[model samples]
Target: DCQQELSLVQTVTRGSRAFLSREEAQHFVKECGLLNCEAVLELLICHLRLGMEIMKLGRQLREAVRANDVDAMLKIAKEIIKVIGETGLDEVYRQLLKAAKEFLERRAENFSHEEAVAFAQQIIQLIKQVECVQMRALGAVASLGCTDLLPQEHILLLTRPRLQELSAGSPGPVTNKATKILRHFEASC
Candidate 1:
């Protein structure tokens, strides 16, 4: 029984830490030779894996934003958006994701740096008002949109706590976003 559980864990965590969809989990069960698995166990595994996937993608998105790789950011942002929509994330989180998408989309279009600053400010303010822990890292990403305009010291001061939270394993995407902002500031200085 222990060996079987271990095998299940390995299979579910194979490619990414993300959760497996129902179909995917079903396929895995069959492949693992577990013909009569419990529904609750399958559900648990799927949900668990989904959370991991979210974290993984979030980290990827943060990396893309930090690199200022607009193409990569857009691609990952789209995936995040899709997952957010499919999973029906809470309202504040959903708003954050939408704002993130807009931030990337606007950046892709070469919007004015000042406009980027405005969007960044808006994101920070929104997350601040809501006090969402998971969304704080995204605030850091938004801040990078205006790294050119903001003084490096000011940027560092504003993003310090968010970066700290990110470093503590808050989540992959948010940490990446915070790291990206810090990198920009460090690069400029």
Candidate 2:
């Protein structure tokens, strides 16, 4: 089965390019009784790459928030929102992304200290609830500056120890970035 699938893919690509024309590929896949497989694979790959891009953007956004770089934060947030809006395969991700986008839009219009603080708190809550480690780290760092907005209990709830557990358990540079974020928050707060 694996060999047959591989051979079919190779034939479709004609041994030169990574992909085939849409019509040709669809025809071949349909003939092979895989009408939905090609589209499913493409969607899977697109979302996989999109997930990584979101993590990178989130990290950049976190840094922007930490530095209080309004321009950078807005630019990065816009990009993040665009990516999130494009491939929201998960309902949780969709809701969080919508909230994040709304926060940025509201911040842009109001531009008040109180509004920023409230926005950060909301972000922290969502990040805490999100299952993705990278997203959680990014959201935590992004909201690190507004720790004062949260109650003492909430502040403790959103501490580095909690983030550390999440970051340390995961692999890759995102973990390092998350750890760095925790340290930064510790020093700042």
Candidate 3:
């Protein structure tokens, strides 16, 4: 029965290092006939403390958006970003960046609502001054796509020039970001 497999895992995990070697890991996966990869991953990851906390915050964030709770949304977003600061998870931040683009597109929609612009402003302030250089560059580059959220004069007058100046500096993520954005603009409009 599967009880024997559970017992095998329990019995073998008593040492200082319980992690399986490559061969044993491959063997376990191959031999784990009843437990598919998805089930195994769910079992392994469901109990993680950080993962659960992330889930909790995301659940609240989802509710906040559903209810049009602006303050709560920003609060949840700030907390999520704070966690990103602590955990250094680039993937999470990247997802957040993509979400922001969609957020602006949805809320701004032909610039009818000021909510999108304000939201963009607040989040930009937070991410721009955030300590991580890569995060800062990420936020900067992504903002380049925010045509409707930010007015045309602001983009042409300040943002574009600033990106150009940053691009002129020659190296690092900021320069790369600046180039990507400039190229993006040149291609689109």
Q: List TM-score per model, in order.
A: 0.33, 0.43, 0.30
Best by TM-score: 2
lDDT of each: 0.48, 0.50, 0.44
> Which 10-residue span in candidate 2 carries the lowest summed lDDT?
10-19
Candidate 1 vs candidate 2, lDDT winner: 2
Model 3: lDDT equals 0.44
Instruction: Give candidate 3 regions above 4 Å deviation.
Output: 1-47, 97-189
- Tell me the deviation in Å of residue 38 in model 3: 23
* Tens-place lDDT digits, model 1, residues 83-170: 6567533343456576767876776565865565555444444434332333331332333334344456655565555455455555
Model 2 CA deviation exceeding 4 Å by range: 1-35, 87-92, 117-189
Q: Candidate 2 on 1-189: residue-level lDDT in tens?
A: 544543443344332222244565445535445433333233323443455565556566667667766666567657767876776344435555776787787864758765664554555445443324334324323342243434444443445455465456447654565566567666555
What order do you get sorting by lDDT, best first? Answer: 2, 1, 3
RMSD of each: 18.6, 19.3, 19.9
The 10-residue segment of model 3 with minimum total lDDT is 41-50
Comparing candidate 2 with candidate 3, which one achieves the higher lDDT? 2
